[PDB]
């Protein structure tokens, strides 16, 4: 992934996460916890479903066409008929091969991006109250009980209420 979050600065995945594609895992005075980020997850699923639909709900009809198997040897005309159908097939087998290639490459980068987006969204929220430990984890330099963690996950974290307690720890 061009963003290097998934399978990058973020070592592993969590087979423990059942309710989402991305989520938080904390450890504070109250112990540990886990929870999926509904806004992030849905963001990528919606994008991938749309992409998928662009590719599935579409087929066109063709009724009368040209023969494709023959019983007797004919020659010139039959040669052409077979070359045309073959040409068609080779070309189409080509787009099919590329499509998936392209689609999938973009699909993994998209998923990587949306992970990275969730990190930035979180780093920006904590402002001067934590530090990026480089492994997808933030070190919140201030007491942050279950409630405080929650406020961060639903994006209502008030960095001001703690800036002093943290500024201290961080720079002492």
């Amino acid at each position: 992934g061009l963003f290097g979050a998934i399978a990058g600065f973020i070592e592993n995945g969590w087979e423990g996460m059942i309710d989402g594609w991305y989520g938080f895992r904390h450890q504070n005075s109250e112990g540990t916890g886990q929870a999926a980020d509904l806004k992030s997850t849905q963001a990528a699923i919606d994008q991938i479903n749309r992409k998928l639909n662009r590719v599935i709900e579409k087929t066109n009809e063709k009724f009368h066409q040209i023969e494709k198997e023959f019983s007797e040897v004919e020659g010139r005309i039959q040669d052409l008929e077979k070359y045309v159908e073959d040409t068609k097939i080779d070309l189409w087998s080509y787009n099919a091969e590329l499509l998936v290639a392209l689609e999938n490459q973009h699909t993994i980068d998209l998923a990587d991006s949306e992970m990275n987006k969730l990190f930035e969204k979180t780093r920006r929220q904590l402002r001067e109250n934590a530090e990026d430990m480089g492994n997808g984890c933030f070190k919140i330099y201030h007491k942050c009980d279950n409630a405080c963690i929650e406020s961060i996950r639903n994006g209502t974290y008030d960095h001001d209420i703690y800036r002093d307690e943290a500024l201290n720890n961080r720079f002492q």
């Binding site: 992934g1 998934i6 399978a7 592993n12 995945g13 969590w14 087979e15 594609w21 991305y22 989520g23 895992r25 904390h26 450890q27 005075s29 990528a44 991938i48 998928l52 590719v55 599935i56 579409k58 087929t59 009809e61 063709k62 009724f63 009368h64 066409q65 023969e67 494709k68 159908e85 097939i89 189409w92 087998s93 099919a96 091969e97 499509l99 998936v100 290639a101 392209l102 999938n104 490459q105 699909t107 993994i108 998923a111 990587d112 992970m115 969730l118 990190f119 934590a130 492994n135 997808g136 984890c137 933030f138 070190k139 919140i140 201030h142 007491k143 942050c144 405080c148 963690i149 961060i152």
Partner: protein, 318 residues
Amino acid sequence: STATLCLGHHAVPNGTIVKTITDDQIEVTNATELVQSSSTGKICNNPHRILDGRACTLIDALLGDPHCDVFQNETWDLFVERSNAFSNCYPYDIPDYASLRSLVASSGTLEFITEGFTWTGVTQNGGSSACKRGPANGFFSRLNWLTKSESAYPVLNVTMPNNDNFDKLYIWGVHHPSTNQEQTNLYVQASGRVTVSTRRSQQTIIPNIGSRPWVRGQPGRISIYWTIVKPGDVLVINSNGNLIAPRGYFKMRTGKSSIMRSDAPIDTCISECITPNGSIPNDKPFQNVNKITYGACPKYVKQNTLKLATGMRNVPEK
């Protein structure tokens, strides 16, 4: 004192493998399939009107081989020719058989309209032991075998106008005796001639006498041709020997009718996309069952499997 918040993503136990612009093998958490590879095995009976040719080929039903009488005027969206069909009538031969099979197939109807031709001076409804209709000798139902009458065969000359608003497909033919004796005996003239024309076209065929391999005991052969008359035009048949006259016309129509060669059984269900191997699901972009298709079918491609990653990259977990 301090806490720890860690962002992460899921990971499944057994991912799926997919190819990318830089990997013909990598692993994501889920993929869907873009190539339909299996067939129910049978051809579903009705989003389309399917007509089973049973033992008849579209031609033999068209000409009217005795056991194809059941198909008189049948219509269809897709005619199914079985590999085990067979001919049980007079030995024939159709130049450009393929084009005739194709234009009838696309017409999708065998609506035969009998007209009142006028054959004066000749015997009608000739028959053969090679086209037994019941215990007697028959012939193609849509054709009329004309032979000499009272020691003579007139310079037959008949006219049939097209005062309708649709096109008429006339199917006549000519007879190739096996010897000179058969020629003079049936037609008197030692040399036949058939000329079917319009203001638009003409095709004059001359019989060719000789011995061909016995087929249902018949050495001769009937050569078949066709003519399309447009509204405002008239047909004119002129022959002084060897004419296998028409009995009328087949009304031509345009639609999405076609024909297919398959031995798959026909069943009761609903399937838009039919193939020689049976109907298949048109919910995928590419299929690999067969390049032969009728209806809303998935584009055919060589590969048998193509995975569309519908999930992020799966990175195990320790």
